[PDB]
Protein backbone atom coordinates (compact mmCIF):
# COMPACT_ATOMS: atom_id res chain seq x y z
CA UNK A 1 0.00 0.00 0.00
CA UNK A 2 1.77 3.60 -1.02
CA UNK A 3 0.17 7.19 -0.94
CA UNK A 4 1.45 7.13 -4.86
CA UNK A 5 1.32 5.38 -7.82
CA UNK A 6 5.22 5.48 -8.68
CA UNK A 7 6.03 4.62 -4.75
CA UNK B 1 12.21 9.69 13.94
CA UNK B 2 11.12 10.48 10.82
CA UNK B 3 12.02 13.81 10.40
CA UNK B 4 12.73 16.33 7.36
CA UNK B 5 14.61 19.63 8.48
CA UNK B 6 14.49 22.54 6.98
CA UNK B 7 15.05 25.91 7.83
CA UNK B 8 12.23 28.50 9.05
CA UNK B 9 12.79 31.54 6.82
CA UNK B 10 14.31 33.14 4.63
CA UNK B 11 14.28 37.18 2.87
CA UNK B 12 16.11 37.55 -0.88
CA UNK B 13 15.50 39.86 -3.08
CA UNK B 14 13.84 39.62 -6.41
CA UNK B 15 16.10 38.81 -9.71
CA UNK B 16 18.52 36.54 -6.61
CA UNK B 17 18.35 33.12 -6.23
CA UNK B 18 17.44 30.47 -3.72
CA UNK B 19 18.74 27.21 -2.59
CA UNK B 20 16.32 25.91 -0.31
CA UNK B 21 17.35 22.36 1.93
CA UNK B 22 15.71 19.58 3.70
CA UNK B 23 17.88 17.46 5.61
CA UNK B 24 16.68 13.91 6.25
CA UNK B 25 16.52 12.04 9.40
CA UNK B 26 15.71 8.84 10.95
CA UNK B 27 15.70 6.95 7.65
CA UNK B 28 17.53 6.69 4.54
CA UNK B 29 16.42 8.36 2.02
CA UNK B 30 17.81 6.55 -1.40
CA UNK B 31 15.16 5.13 -1.98
CA UNK B 32 11.88 7.73 -1.20
CA UNK B 33 10.77 10.24 -3.79
CA UNK B 34 11.28 14.12 -1.77
CA UNK B 35 8.69 16.03 -3.40
CA UNK B 36 8.77 19.80 -3.01
CA UNK B 37 5.38 21.67 -2.84
CA UNK B 38 4.17 25.63 -2.79
CA UNK B 39 2.11 27.25 -0.17
CA UNK B 40 0.77 30.41 -0.76
CA UNK B 41 -2.18 32.07 1.03
CA UNK B 42 -4.79 32.83 -1.25
CA UNK B 43 -3.63 30.33 -4.03
CA UNK B 44 -4.11 26.48 -2.74
CA UNK B 45 -0.95 23.99 -2.79
CA UNK B 46 0.92 23.46 -5.50
CA UNK B 47 3.22 20.35 -5.92
CA UNK B 48 6.56 21.63 -7.85
CA UNK B 49 7.71 18.12 -8.29
CA UNK B 50 9.69 15.33 -6.96
CA UNK B 51 13.71 13.72 -7.20
CA UNK B 52 14.44 10.31 -6.62
CA UNK B 53 18.07 10.24 -4.40
CA UNK B 54 19.00 7.27 -6.14
CA UNK B 55 19.84 7.66 -9.75
CA UNK B 56 18.26 11.45 -9.67
CA UNK B 57 15.19 10.68 -11.46
CA UNK B 58 12.58 13.84 -11.03
CA UNK B 59 9.23 14.12 -12.07
CA UNK B 60 8.31 18.19 -12.31
CA UNK B 61 5.18 20.37 -12.28
CA UNK B 62 5.81 21.79 -16.33
CA UNK B 63 4.83 24.72 -14.31
CA UNK B 64 8.22 25.18 -12.39
CA UNK B 65 10.63 23.73 -14.26
CA UNK B 66 12.99 26.49 -14.76
CA UNK B 67 11.59 27.81 -11.36
CA UNK B 68 12.62 25.05 -9.84
CA UNK B 69 15.63 22.60 -10.09
CA UNK B 70 15.91 19.62 -7.41
CA UNK B 71 19.08 17.64 -6.63
CA UNK B 72 20.27 16.01 -3.92
CA UNK B 73 23.56 15.09 -1.90
CA UNK B 74 23.97 11.54 -0.89
CA UNK B 75 26.61 11.96 1.82
CA UNK B 76 24.43 14.35 3.64
CA UNK B 77 21.26 12.68 3.34
CA UNK B 78 19.70 16.26 2.49
CA UNK B 79 17.45 17.27 -0.58
CA UNK B 80 17.72 20.47 -2.11
CA UNK B 81 15.52 23.02 -4.53
CA UNK B 82 16.77 25.66 -5.84
CA UNK B 83 14.31 28.69 -6.93
CA UNK B 84 15.92 31.05 -9.91
CA UNK B 85 15.14 34.74 -11.08
CA UNK B 86 13.12 35.36 -7.69
CA UNK B 87 10.06 37.80 -7.92
CA UNK B 88 7.00 38.57 -5.85
CA UNK B 89 5.22 35.63 -6.90
CA UNK B 90 8.01 33.11 -5.17
CA UNK B 91 7.20 34.40 -1.39
CA UNK B 92 5.03 31.74 -0.19
CA UNK B 93 6.01 28.78 2.40
CA UNK B 94 7.54 25.63 0.65
CA UNK B 95 7.44 22.07 1.61
CA UNK B 96 9.77 18.92 0.97
CA UNK B 97 8.03 15.82 1.79
CA UNK B 98 8.99 11.74 1.50
CA UNK B 99 7.29 8.98 -0.41
CA UNK B 100 5.51 6.74 0.26
CA UNK B 101 4.98 6.79 4.39
CA UNK B 102 5.15 10.53 3.70
CA UNK B 103 6.08 13.04 6.24
CA UNK B 104 6.96 16.73 5.74
CA UNK B 105 9.35 19.15 6.40
CA UNK B 106 8.13 22.09 8.83
CA UNK B 107 8.47 24.26 5.40
CA UNK B 108 10.29 26.89 4.57
CA UNK B 109 8.86 30.78 4.65
CA UNK B 110 10.67 32.16 1.77
CA UNK B 111 9.86 36.19 1.19
CA UNK B 112 11.21 37.99 -2.35
CA UNK B 113 11.30 41.81 -1.26
CA UNK B 114 13.61 44.81 -2.20
CA UNK C 1 -3.88 17.61 -15.16
CA UNK C 2 -6.03 15.75 -12.84
CA UNK C 3 -8.50 18.79 -10.48
CA UNK C 4 -9.72 17.94 -7.23
CA UNK C 5 -12.78 19.68 -6.05
CA UNK C 6 -12.78 19.41 -2.72
CA UNK C 7 -15.99 19.98 0.06
CA UNK C 8 -16.63 21.79 2.08
CA UNK C 9 -14.62 24.81 2.21
CA UNK C 10 -15.20 25.25 5.72
CA UNK C 11 -17.33 23.65 7.78
CA UNK C 12 -18.07 24.51 11.60
CA UNK C 13 -18.35 21.16 14.48
CA UNK C 14 -19.03 20.36 17.87
CA UNK C 15 -16.45 18.24 19.58
CA UNK C 16 -17.64 15.13 19.68
CA UNK C 17 -19.32 15.42 16.38
CA UNK C 18 -18.71 13.10 12.88
CA UNK C 19 -17.42 15.50 10.54
CA UNK C 20 -17.13 14.24 7.00
CA UNK C 21 -14.95 16.14 4.03
CA UNK C 22 -15.10 15.21 0.03
CA UNK C 23 -12.68 14.99 -2.54
CA UNK C 24 -13.73 14.87 -5.86
CA UNK C 25 -11.71 14.37 -8.83
CA UNK C 26 -12.02 14.91 -12.63
CA UNK C 27 -10.60 11.17 -13.54
CA UNK C 28 -10.17 8.04 -12.38
CA UNK C 29 -7.52 7.97 -9.52
CA UNK C 30 -7.08 4.41 -9.44
CA UNK C 31 -7.35 4.58 -5.41
CA UNK C 32 -4.44 6.99 -4.83
CA UNK C 33 -6.27 9.59 -2.93
CA UNK C 34 -4.43 10.59 0.21
CA UNK C 35 -5.47 13.29 3.02
CA UNK C 36 -3.25 15.32 4.98
CA UNK C 37 -3.93 17.41 7.97
CA UNK C 38 -2.26 21.31 8.65
CA UNK C 39 -1.65 22.76 11.83
CA UNK C 40 -1.73 27.21 12.44
CA UNK C 41 2.08 26.05 13.12
CA UNK C 42 2.16 25.04 9.53
CA UNK C 43 2.79 21.37 10.89
CA UNK C 44 1.73 18.58 8.25
CA UNK C 45 1.20 15.55 8.75
CA UNK C 46 -0.28 12.39 6.16
CA UNK C 47 -3.36 11.19 8.05
CA UNK C 48 -4.41 8.77 5.25
CA UNK C 49 -3.36 7.31 2.19
CA UNK C 50 -4.75 4.91 -0.93
CA UNK C 51 -8.19 5.98 0.44
CA UNK C 52 -8.51 4.79 3.67
CA UNK C 53 -5.15 3.18 5.00
CA UNK C 54 -4.34 5.30 8.41
CA UNK C 55 -0.42 6.13 8.61
CA UNK C 56 1.41 5.30 11.98
CA UNK C 57 0.07 6.89 14.98
CA UNK C 58 -3.19 8.10 13.18
CA UNK C 59 -6.29 7.57 15.82
CA UNK C 60 -8.76 5.21 15.16
CA UNK C 61 -11.62 7.69 14.60
CA UNK C 62 -10.20 8.91 11.57
CA UNK C 63 -11.11 6.87 8.19
CA UNK C 64 -11.53 7.66 4.51
CA UNK C 65 -14.04 6.11 2.45
CA UNK C 66 -14.14 5.93 -1.49
CA UNK C 67 -13.45 4.93 -5.30
CA UNK C 68 -12.82 5.76 -8.66
CA UNK C 69 -13.27 10.25 -8.20
CA UNK C 70 -15.13 9.69 -5.28
CA UNK C 71 -13.53 10.27 -2.03
CA UNK C 72 -14.24 11.38 1.78
CA UNK C 73 -12.65 11.56 4.58
CA UNK C 74 -14.79 10.68 8.00
CA UNK C 75 -13.72 11.95 11.50
CA UNK C 76 -16.71 9.98 13.66
CA UNK C 77 -16.30 11.69 17.14
CA UNK C 78 -14.19 14.60 16.81
CA UNK C 79 -11.52 16.43 19.52
CA UNK C 80 -9.91 19.22 19.67
CA UNK C 81 -6.59 18.75 18.36
CA UNK C 82 -8.18 18.03 15.18
CA UNK C 83 -9.45 21.02 14.43
CA UNK C 84 -7.42 22.23 11.75
CA UNK C 85 -6.74 22.50 8.12
CA UNK C 86 -7.49 19.67 5.64
CA UNK C 87 -6.77 18.83 2.39
CA UNK C 88 -6.49 15.99 0.14
CA UNK C 89 -3.61 15.45 -2.68
CA UNK C 90 -4.55 12.49 -5.80
CA UNK C 91 -1.52 10.30 -6.58
CA UNK C 92 -3.10 8.62 -9.40
CA UNK C 93 -1.11 10.67 -12.12
CA UNK C 94 1.40 13.35 -12.56
CA UNK C 95 1.56 16.29 -11.85
CA UNK C 96 0.06 15.37 -8.44
CA UNK C 97 -2.13 17.80 -7.61
CA UNK C 98 -4.23 19.06 -4.12
CA UNK C 99 -8.00 20.04 -3.30
CA UNK C 100 -8.65 23.33 -1.91
CA UNK C 101 -9.10 22.54 1.60
CA UNK C 102 -11.15 22.54 4.36
CA UNK C 103 -10.81 24.75 7.27
CA UNK C 104 -12.61 22.75 10.18
CA UNK C 105 -13.90 24.75 13.17
CA UNK C 106 -15.53 25.28 16.29
CA UNK C 107 -19.32 25.57 16.15
CA UNK C 108 -19.86 28.07 19.25
Known amino acids: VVSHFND | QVQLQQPGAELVKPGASVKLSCKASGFTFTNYWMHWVKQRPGQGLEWIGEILPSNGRTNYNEKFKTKATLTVDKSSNTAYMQLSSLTSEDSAVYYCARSPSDYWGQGTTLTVSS | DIQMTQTPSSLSASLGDRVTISCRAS??????LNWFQQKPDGTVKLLIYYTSTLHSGVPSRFSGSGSGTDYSLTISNLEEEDIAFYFC?????????FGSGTKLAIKR
Open chain 3, 27 to 32: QDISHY
Open chain 3, 89 to 97: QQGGALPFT
